[PDB]
Design a protein around this ligand. Sequence first.
Ligand SMILES: Cc1cc2nc3c(=O)[nH]c(=O)nc-3n(C[C@H](O)[C@H](O)[C@H](O)COP(=O)(O)OP(=O)(O)OC[C@H]3O[C@@H](n4cnc5c(N)ncnc54)[C@H](O)[C@@H]3O)c2cc1C
Ligand SMILES: CCCCC/C=C\C=C\CCCCCCCCC(=O)O
Length: 423
Amino acid sequence: SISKDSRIAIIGAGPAGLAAGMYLEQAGFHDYTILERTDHVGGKCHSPNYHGRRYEMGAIMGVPSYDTIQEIMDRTGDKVDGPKLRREFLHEDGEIYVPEKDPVRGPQVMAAVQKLGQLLATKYQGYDANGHYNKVHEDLMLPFDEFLALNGCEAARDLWINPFTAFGYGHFDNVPAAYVLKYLDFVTMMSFAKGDLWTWADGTQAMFEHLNATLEHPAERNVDITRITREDGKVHIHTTDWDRESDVLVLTVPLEKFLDYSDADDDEREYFSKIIHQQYMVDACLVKEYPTISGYVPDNMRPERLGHVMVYYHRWADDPHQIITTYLLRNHPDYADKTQEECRQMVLDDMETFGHPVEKIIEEQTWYYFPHVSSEDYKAGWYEKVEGMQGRRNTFYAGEIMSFGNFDEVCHYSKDLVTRFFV
Ligand SMILES: Cc1cc2nc3c(=O)[nH]c(=O)nc-3n(C[C@H](O)[C@H](O)[C@H](O)COP(=O)(O)OP(=O)(O)OC[C@H]3O[C@@H](n4cnc5c(N)ncnc54)[C@H](O)[C@@H]3O)c2cc1C
Ligand SMILES: CCCCC/C=C\C=C\CCCCCCCCC(=O)O
């Protein structure tokens, strides 16, 4: 429905933008340009060097059902070749426990998991589709805990919480089930629970760097876009060094932030203003009494413990002078959010409690993480509206807000965007 000769501007060279480029190009659209604000590609797949090995400041892992990322590796020749992930569980006092072996709670949890699985397989078919343009069951629009309570599956939250809340995506009291279950669908949940998890020796960034290089048009970097306007059936992009016209705009960058440098119409301003996000903070640490395994702290995943370390990543087992990254959240809709300063101190205090005291923090990043909307906004039909706007003034909406904030979901979405509107 769009001509192959169209000049397509793709904003952002993260996974979503690079995938958009890949799949446009493979569909015969050769006149695309990817515009990246920073000097690097990969976005939140960001794998810096330290003493000859790359550590992860952002994304780390995948599961075997990451089919779109497999397609990307097929193209780049990259392989899943990183160190194996292994985990223990700690209480907030640092004591090691084995929740799977609890003879009372364990069965309750796994019975709820069984029950939920069947609801997903029968009543809630369609729940796991990529994106939100196929309207999900109304129950899925409620916060996850409410969704679970409606079906008597509350205890299943013990299994779902670990790769969700600890992983920055927020808390089941408020995050709609729709996101939780598109990310952690039954198969994905099962893979995680099993530890069947992809990692990369060269970092998740590496395959995106390699993908960018395979493109007919590798991303243009250091592009400071000051204004985008969309008059006369055209797209006009003003940057600090040039201003140029395009036929189509594909956005893989934060849509609320897009309002600030664009001729955003009333609907764009109205809806994109409803976007909320997570403040997910990662500290790259050198530690004494080096851990022997990664640690998760369910106690610190409760909203009452906001800002505490929920998980830390043991990446390079053989070298106790390698980087251990820690993970915490600074926000929750029903709490005063936490400062960088007080959270950094909890990193220190928590790691000390866990028996792996921090000697040095070499890097720290609060990420713009998991853009989404509230249950109320989801229920009021946020996605019916925005997806209805796809193509308005030659503009297409993609990236994390349109799908889910993991790198397979956004790439899958970019791939399908080509199929939906372009081919
Ligand atoms: C700590 C952490 C851990 C994670 N763990 C995992 C994991 O284990 N597995 C997984 O699948 N996912 C994980 N993720 C999520 C995953 O990294 C993201 O969902 C994915 O990178 C999203 O891709 P994207 O292209 O939509 O957005 P992004 O990765 O954020 O890329 C956006 C790009 O657009 C650029 N940009 C922003 N504004 C502008 C502008 N004004 N003009 C031009 N360019 C702009 C940015 O610089 C960036 O390059 C993790 C993320 C973090 C932060
Ligand atoms: C199902 C996993 C794919 C998506 C993951 C998305 C976000 C992850 C965010 C942060 C992860 C912190 C990692 C700590 C190491 C885990 C070790 C283990 O689980 O065995």
